[PDB]
Design a protein around this nucleic acid. Structure first.
Lengths: 135, 50, 49, 48
RNA sequence: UGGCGGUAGCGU
DNA sequence: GGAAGATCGAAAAAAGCACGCTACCGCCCGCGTGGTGGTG
DNA sequence: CACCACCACGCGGGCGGTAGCGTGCTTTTTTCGATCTTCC
């Protein structure tokens, strides 16, 4: 009955959309990995998302409608395969929450290999789409 | 005659039909339809008869 | 004033004039209702080839 | 051709609107984004 | 060194 | 002797709406992030 | 010399919003679901 959707939030307001969604009793997830990247000085903990303007949400449409999510501040729209928003089961976000250092694990090793931010979130959507095809 | 033509037979069906007319494409939900009906004419923030 | 340019599209796009100008040329040629035509063009339904 | 859609000077440091240029810029942006997405082996939803 | 929009007016 | 053909009424979409001229103003990204320069 | 302020700027597009917006014309064409008909 509960549905996991993916939100292409507005550019530059990821944290604002996060707090606004958390205010509406909606479980929101932003994958977090620092990769120990190098800031202007030296290597530190940058703590940047997979790639910006991307969020995961869990909400039953019966209690809270998708129009409310669309009107939430900081978020632009969903991603809809065909004509309806993509359905996402719990396996992907279980794997994402558990592993925060199989095939998904090899995906994570890929993420740690390239650090190209667009590519990190790109392989993230690749893995989630692979699971969606499996489902 | 209008009632005979009318396909709806309950308050929920009428609310769902109203929501479908107002917002085509969106999934008609009980809470969404009720909120839209309440805010259409019975809310001071959206309706104001001077 | 006379030299033209061109853009190489990554994916094909339907011409709006030959699709939306009633009667639809693409729909008439394919013997298919227009609703299927622009629900397939805009990525909402699959069509068998 | 550019002369048929000129970018006239406003004599104040800025230029005209040139809606044709804006639409061409949007089309070029979409085409370049789609090309980059295809070169990245994107999943079906994103390319769609 | 141009376009768009709004406003008012003139002759029909 | 019940589904294609014909009808058909309503809903939607597209096209059009005189000519010439004068004067004025308002406007012609964006935004909100980040790279980079200045600095206590 | 890592922290604030100024200008490139980048992709972004409907905006701002925790949603709608629309509200005094006429004619022609499409079309689409609903209804009646008739014969294979």
């Amino acid at each position: 009955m509960q549905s996991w959707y993916l939100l292409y939030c507005k550019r530059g307001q990821l944290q604002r959309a996060q707090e606004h969604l958390e205010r509406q009793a909606v479980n929101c997830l932003a994958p977090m990995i620092t990769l120990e990247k190098i800031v202007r000085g030296k290597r530190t903990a940058v703590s940047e998302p997979l790639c910006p303007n991307y969020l995961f949400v869990e909400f039953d449409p019966e209690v809270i409608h998708t129009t409310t999510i669309n009107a939430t501040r900081g978020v632009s729209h969903f991603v809809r395969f065909g004509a309806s928003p993509a359905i996402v089961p719990s396996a992907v976000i279980h794997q994402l929450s558990v592993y925060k250092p199989e095939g998904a694990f090899e995906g994570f090793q890929a993420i740690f290999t390239e650090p190209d931010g667009e590519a990190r979130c790109m392989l993230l959507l690749n893995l989630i789409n692979k699971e969606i095809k499996h489902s | 005659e209008t009632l005979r033509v009318d396909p709806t037979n309950d308050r929920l069906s009428a609310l769902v039909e109203i929501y479908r007319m107002m917002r085509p494409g969106e999934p008609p939900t009980r809470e969404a339809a009720e909120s839209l009906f309440e805010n259409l004419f019975f809310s001071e923030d959206r309706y104001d008869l001077s | 004033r006379e030299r033209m340019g061109h853009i190489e599209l990554a994916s094909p796009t339907a011409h709006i004039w030959f699709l939306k100008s009633l009667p639809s040329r693409i729909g008439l040629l394919l013997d298919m209702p227009l609703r299927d035509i622009e629900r397939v063009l805009y990525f909402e339904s699959y069509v068998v080839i | 051709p550019p002369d048929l859609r000129p970018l006239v000077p406003l004599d104040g440091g800025r230029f005209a609107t040139s809606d044709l240029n804006d639409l061409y810029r949007r089309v070029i942006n979409r085409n370049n984004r789609l090309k980059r997405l295809l070169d990245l082996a994107a999943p079906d939803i994103i390319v769609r």
